[PDB]
Amino acid sequence: DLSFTGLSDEQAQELHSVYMSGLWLFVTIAVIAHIAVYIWRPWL
Amino acid sequence: LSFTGLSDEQAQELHSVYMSGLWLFVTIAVIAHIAVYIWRPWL
Amino acid sequence: LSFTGLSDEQAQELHSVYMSGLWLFVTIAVIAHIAVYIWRPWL
Amino acid sequence: LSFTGLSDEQAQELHSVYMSGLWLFVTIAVIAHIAVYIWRPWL
Amino acid sequence: EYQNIFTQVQVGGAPEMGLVEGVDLSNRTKGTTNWTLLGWFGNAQIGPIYLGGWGTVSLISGVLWFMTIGAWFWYEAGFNPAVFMRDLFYLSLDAPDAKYGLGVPRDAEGIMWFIASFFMFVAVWSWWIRTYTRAAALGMGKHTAWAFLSAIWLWMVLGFIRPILMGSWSEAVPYGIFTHLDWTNNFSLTYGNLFYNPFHGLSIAFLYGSALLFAMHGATILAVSRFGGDRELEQIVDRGTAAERAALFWRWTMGFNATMEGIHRWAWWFGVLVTLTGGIGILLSGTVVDNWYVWAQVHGYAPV
Amino acid sequence: NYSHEPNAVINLRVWALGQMVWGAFLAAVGVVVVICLLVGTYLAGLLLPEQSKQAPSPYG
Amino acid sequence: MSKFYKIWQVFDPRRVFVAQGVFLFLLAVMIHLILLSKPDYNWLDVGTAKYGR
Amino acid sequence: MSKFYKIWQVFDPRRVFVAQGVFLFLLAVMIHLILLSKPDYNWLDVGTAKYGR
Amino acid sequence: MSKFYKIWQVFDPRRVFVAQGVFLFLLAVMIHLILLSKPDYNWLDVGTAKYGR
Amino acid sequence: MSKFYKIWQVFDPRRVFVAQGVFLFLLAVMIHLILLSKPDYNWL
Amino acid sequence: MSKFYKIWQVFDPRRVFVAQGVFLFLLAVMIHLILLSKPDYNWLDVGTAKYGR
Amino acid sequence: MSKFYKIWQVFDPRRVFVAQGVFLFLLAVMIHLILLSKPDYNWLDVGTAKYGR
Amino acid sequence: MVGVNFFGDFDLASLAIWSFWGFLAFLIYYLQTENMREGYPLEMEDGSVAPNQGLFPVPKPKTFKLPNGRGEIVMPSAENEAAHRRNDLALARTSVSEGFPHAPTGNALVDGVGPASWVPRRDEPELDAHGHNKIMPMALAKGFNVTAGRDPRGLPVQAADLEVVGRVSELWVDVPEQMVRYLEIDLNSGKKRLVPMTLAKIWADRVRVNAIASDSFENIPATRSASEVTKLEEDKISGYVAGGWLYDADKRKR
Amino acid sequence: ALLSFERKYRVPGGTLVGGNLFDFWVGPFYVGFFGVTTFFFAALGTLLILYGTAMEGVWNPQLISIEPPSVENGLAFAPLAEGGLWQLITICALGAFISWALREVEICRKLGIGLHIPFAFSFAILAYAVLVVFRPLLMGSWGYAFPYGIWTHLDWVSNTGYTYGNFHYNPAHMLGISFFFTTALALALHGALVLSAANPEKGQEMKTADHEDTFFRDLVGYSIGTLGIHRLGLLLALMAVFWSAVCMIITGTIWFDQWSNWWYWWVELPWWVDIPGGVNG
Ligand SMILES: CCCCCCCCCCCCCCCCCC(=O)OC[C@H](COP(=O)([O-])OCC(O)COP(=O)([O-])OC[C@@H](COC(=O)CCCCCCCCCCCCCCCCC)OC(=O)CCCCCCCCCCCCCCCCC)OC(=O)CCCCCCCCCCCCCCCCC
Ligand code: BCL
Ligand SMILES: COC(C)(C)C/C=C/C(C)=C/C=C/C(C)=C/C=C/C(C)=C/C=C/C=C(C)/C=C/C=C(\C)CC/C=C(\C)CCC=C(C)C
Ligand SMILES: COC(C)(C)C/C=C/C(C)=C/C=C/C(C)=C/C=C/C(C)=C/C=C/C=C(C)/C=C/C=C(\C)CC/C=C(\C)CCC=C(C)C
Ligand SMILES: COC(C)(C)C/C=C/C(C)=C/C=C/C(C)=C/C=C/C(C)=C/C=C/C=C(C)/C=C/C=C(\C)CC/C=C(\C)CCC=C(C)C
Ligand SMILES: COC(C)(C)C/C=C/C(C)=C/C=C/C(C)=C/C=C/C(C)=C/C=C\C=C(C)\C=C\C=C(/C)CC/C=C(\C)CCC=C(C)C
Ligand SMILES: [Fe+2]
């Protein structure tokens, strides 16, 4: 129904799925790197 | 009455979703302030 | 009368919701002022 | 959706070539990073 | 690619003598002149002036002021023209000695200063009244007088008021080209570091803001002069794409904009606030604050 | 006739490389101009008396 | 006291909402700051003092 | 508390969203910097000290 | 949480993505500099000392 | 992870490629100048 | 004394309420600060002393 | 003297009332502060002495 | 009054600086409200009225009483905005979202969009105090002679595509200001057309107009009168010409 | 977000770099390539200012100060805690300013208006650079530049000016002063004139350019014209900043002593030196 952008729930779910894929990839990389930096030099 | 063009139902849905997000934010924040109070209390 | 063109009913409604929000605010503030007073009073 | 005028096929092609070049870049860069760890380590 | 800085083609005609809106035409002149050296950057007509009563007051008093200072310059120079044209900048009608306090100085330099100052008083106030009247006769608003009054406020604060509050005409400014600079320096040095006079900082803010603003306004109006933005009075009433384009430039740039009348309102304030804040900051120097760096330390903008 | 690449992928690849290298050339031009600016400044400073490099500090 | 719902017949909810939100926030900040600037109400300095850190 | 959703019959979600996003980010940055300037909560200096570096 | 996808019924991908890139790169640079500011956590000087160079 | 090709439906690729060229060259000079500053990591 | 509702026929209640609100907040802040100045009415210092904190 | 009411035929009521408010506030704020300056008239310091606090 | 704190560290200096902060606040209010007389109420791309009408309220209407019996102008007002409102706009939304452009559907120099936009000023000319028209051709302006500079009249008019289109004929002048606003062209096509002096650079041998190319010089709006020119025609002309710095650039050479 | 006339101008184009990528608006603001750059640089510089004062432990906005490296550091890059922050913030500030100018350019050519405004701004960037980039390089060290503190760049001004005695005697400084004063003057006069025409006495009609010209001809015998006054104030500001940049680039590079000793070349001209009279005899 409401769309200030034109996208209907369908295109929205599609775009969201891909965006979240990218986000979880980014986050995986960052988690790996944080674990590493903890091993090498902890900060807590 | 609607200064933005919404109806009560569009608003109610938007608000359920906003509330979901807000409660998720608050949840993570609570987890973190807890971990902190366990690691270096400020009270 | 209206300087903004609202009717008594929409206004009564707005005021209801505004007062509810205000009272929630004050309630949480009171919780906090009490906690603070128990932990470190000022009066 | 297509904001830029491209279709899924054209976009697939363009992405294939882009990521070709990307993996080339990362290959060269990891090589050079290795050689530098050889020269002046930093961990 | 024509930026409209220098006029390419000049034109002229019979001089534009004036507009009779209640002006006394006999107090007006009838001789004009053309001088193209200006036509390149502005109108070339060195047009008729108004010779009125207040104007005569001003001219007479101020010429006496000028020639008085020149007289003391001569006496201070040994009447040697070469000394005059040598020490011209180093000379001074220095201000009275503090011994006299606010009394009429019992010296020559001092009373000459006092008299020259009386003349300046007469001249400046006559000119202010002349602004008011010239804007009242053409039926215009008195914005120019209330702007000048701001300048007068500072000038008074420096010559008349601040000293009366401090009890010495020694505090007032000498009439020289380098001695009034020395006065400013010694004023800062005596009273802390004037920079820490918040009202000094504000007057500075508004001086820099006046330059900022006039460059902005002028560059805009030359940018939209290709749509006749130079004609402003007609874009306040009959808006055109000049005003719209200028407004939208500033909107898309910094998020807010003005109108072809409200930018003029902004200008009238950045100008007068330069001398309103200065007057106050000078009044308060020595009457309320003997040192400003310590006031800052105490007030938190300077460190202990 | 010459310059004709039959393949679609090779045509796309040489185009994108051209675009990327164009951008990098712009950036290099900018960096080089900045460099010439600062370095010419320093050099012209070497032409100045020795009292330029003696001046007291304002501590700030 | 019963008619106060007419401040909505006089004012516009948008401007009042934003304004009073700004007001509450800046007030909260000023107050927290006044505390922090006093060693007996700085929860942080007090904590590092209480826990012997 | 049962008609808060009516706020969106008042404010536009685009603006509200951008505003609160900026607000939260700056708030977080300021709190983090505050701690970072208090050396009893500077997690970096702590971890240096706790792990002897 | 089920319906977060409606965010793209509010915002446009283009502006959102510009924002995201800018903000993430800014944040990364900021934190890297934060670290390089400490004589510790500065991988470069740490390695310099560790290997006695 | 496989539907990332949809970014070229969002952004014109010509300009994106020029921009990447700029970004990467500038990042390179940034790090080289960072490293050059340090005597341990300077090579000249 | 009873005719004082006619000042609403000279003044726009909007202007007046905004101006009263501002005046009131500023007066209050001013006074509370004139108090925080005097060591005898700084209720915070008073509490510190009373409670031996 | 009973014909002083023509003042409302000369001056506008709105302008007069606003000017009057500002005038009186500034006078009063001023008088109270002049009184504050002298200690003998600083009711707060006076109280601190009356009650020996 | 040295060392005289009313309370705490507060002396005349502190009181004055704070009073200034207050006055300044009121002043920013005043100015940013007086900058609202034109343009508000805020619109969407749909032409509607939006929820965010600013945090500063639009001020109360004032009145401009015009010279020469042109009437009363009230700002802010609906008549003011509706007169200067353009309609039948050749524009197409680039996206359903807001904050994105709107493309010109057809020829923009003609359709009056973008840098080539114009505003419906009133088809009455600009007047001096005496009520005579402001812009007269130099031939009706009695007494007007070139007092300096290069007299352009009779010089060819080179355009952005470096091609030539005609010869200057007459100079339109601001008599009360004594300066040249527009210059007229005797075009090859047998037509007369104006061009602002600020957009024409007088060389020794010619007049250069790098704004527009030659195809455009013919479709320039004309004047219903050859002795006068109204504000409307001025805006149309000036917009048309200025739009060539964007919409005829593929043609501009050198 | 739009004004009642903002639409027909919201068309594509007028972009030096980029294209469709970045031709959009965020609220009222236009953001192109250079909008993104200026936002990034500004935000980074701001956050670094805050971290610098955080490391210091200062949180008062008036006492916050990020200072340049020592003078002994010379022109090398320093540790972030001893000048590196100031240097990065300088980099970011300059990028931000130049990008603001180029954004203004993009907008000026989308709205089809001249490029006078970015030109004017360029002089200010030039002066900032004169202070923090050029003058140092020629003087040999970054530490001769000014700090990023509200009340500390004033201390830099004071000390730098008292190095050469009363800076008032620098002539280029004199011209800067004079043009600044005349700028404020002309600004006030312009605004007052226009407002006095548009907003005249009660019960009178609006006025016109003829009345302005006549009032100022009456007052001082000359009127510069509606275009000439804009031209004039613009040039005044620019020449002011020009003289101000000229005054500083020659202070510690070509001149080294008190500035008063400069004017003594007029005294010491052989045909009025020995004369015993006046101040210098
Ligand atoms: C605890 C405290 C907390 C904080 C408290 C804060 C309280 C805030 C309250 C609100 C105040 C807001 C004031 C700003 C509004 C003005 C807006 C505007 O631009 O135009 C309005 C608008 C202008 O009208 P217009 O659009 O031009 O057209 C009107 C006519 O149709 C055609 O026009 P016209 O030709 O008939 O008349 C033109 C004139 C319309 O106005 C007038 O005609 C009257 C203007 C006032 C003139 C002076 C009054 C007469 C007596 C003067 C006494 C001087 C003594 C010296 C000897 C005598 C000299 C004559 O236009 C104006 O622009 C008027 C504004 C002028 C302001 C003053 C500028 C010069 C002052 C320079 C300094 C000198 C004094 C020293 C100050 C420092 C002292 C420590 O006028 C009004 O709205 C009413 C006039 C307001 C009367 C004056 C009140 C404000 C004065 C403030 C001055 C600053 C004080 C310092 C601040 C504190 C520092 C510590
Ligand atoms: C080293 C000394 C101190 C210092 C000491 C002072 C002192 C002392 C004063 C200021 C003042 C000012 N200083 Mg300083 N100032 C310093 C540092 C600075 C710096 C800087 C970058 O460091 C700047 C930019 C400024 C800025 C300023 C201005 C903002 C301000 C005066 C504005 C003005 O219009 O004056 C000039 C304006 C007038 C005098 C108006 C006079 C108008 C009348 C009507 C003239 C009559 C005309 C007459 C008849 C002549 C006829 C001519 C013919 C008809 C042609 N100063 C240093 C640190 N400065 C003034 C101020 O406000 O103090 C806070 C002031 O008095
Ligand atoms: C100063 O204080 C300090 C810094 C010390 C401490 C504080 C730090 C703070 C406050 C840090 C905050 C960090 C935050 C808030 C981080 C948030 C990160 C997030 C939200 C990251 C999201 C990343 C998402 C990514 C990388 C997504 C990428 C997606 C793609 C590359 C593919 C998407 C493809 C699409 C859309 C194609 C489909 C499109 C169409 C049109 C069909
Ligand atoms: C030196 O000074 C110090 C600080 C030390 C001492 C002085 C302190 C002072 C002066 C403090 C003053 C404090 C004051 C005056 C506080 C006032 C606070 C108020 C009035 C708070 C109000 C809060 C209101 C809230 C949070 C309202 C929330 C409302 C909602 C969430 C409901 C949403 C509304 C909707 C949806 C409207 C319905 C709309 C339609 C169309 C149906
Ligand atoms: C001195 O001051 C210090 C800092 C020391 C102390 C004081 C600190 C203060 C004053 C702190 C104040 C903090 C406050 C006021 C925090 C408030 C936080 C809030 C309200 C956070 C809210 C977060 C909400 C989130 C993240 C919501 C997210 C929602 C979504 C992702 C979904 C968006 C909506 C969608 C998709 C629905 C669209 C549907 C349709 C039909 C269009
Ligand atoms: C070529 O040689 C001849 C003799 C032919 C002519 C030469 C003339 C020359 C060389 C003239 C030179 C004049 C100069 C150098 C003038 C410089 C003046 C300067 C720089 C003045 C600067 C500031 C002056 C101020 C702020 C003075 C303010 C004075 C007042 C506000 C006066 C207020 C009233 C006072 C002091 C008391 C009198 C009051 C009453 C009511 C009688
Ligand atoms: Fe103007």
Numbering used by the authors:
A (entry chain 0): 6 to 49
B (entry chain B), C (entry chain E), D (entry chain 8): 7 to 49
E (entry chain M): 3 to 306
F (entry chain X): 5 to 64
G (entry chain D), H (entry chain A), I (entry chain 9), K (entry chain F), L (entry chain I): 1 to 53
J (entry chain 7): 1 to 44
M (entry chain H): 1 to 254
N (entry chain L): 2 to 282
Study text:
In the RC-LH1 dimer, two crossing PufX polypeptides mediate dimerization. Unlike Rhodabacter sphaeroides counterpart, Rba. blasticus RC-LH1 dimer has a less bent conformation, lacks the PufY subunit near the LH1 opening, and includes two extra LH1 αβ subunits, forming a more enclosed S-shaped LH1 ring. The long and short dimensions of the dimeric supercomplex are 214 and 117 Å, respectively. Our cryo-EM structure shows that the dimerization interface of the RC-LH1 supercomplex in Rba. blasticus involves two PufX polypeptides. The crossing angle for the PufX dimer in Rba. blasticus is approximately 84°, which is greater than that of the Rba. sphaeroides PufX dimer (73°). In addition to the interactions of the N-terminal region of PufX with LH1-1α of the adjacent monomer, direct hydrogen bonds were found at the interface of two PufX polypeptides (between Glu9 and Gln23) to facilitate the PufX dimerization, whereas no detectable polar interactions were identified at the same interface in the Rba. sphaeroides RC-LH1 dimer. Therefore, it is postulated that Glu9, Asn15, and Gln23 of PufX are important for maintaining the dimerization of Rba. blasticus PufX and RC-LH1. The dimeric RC-LH1 of Rba. blasticus contains double the number of cofactors as the monomeric RC-LH1, and the locations of these pigment molecules are similar. LH1-1 and LH1-1′ from neighboring monomers are closely associated, characterized by BChls with Mg-Mg distances of approximately 8.6 Å. In contrast, the maximum quinone/quinol exchange rate of the Rba. blasticus RC-LH1 dimer (2.2 ± 0.1 e− RC−1 s−1, Km = 0.59 ± 0.2 μM, N = 3) was 21% slower than that of Rba. sphaeroides RC-LH1 dimer (2.8 ± 0.2 e− RC−1 s−1, Km = 0.70 ± 0.3 μM, N = 3).
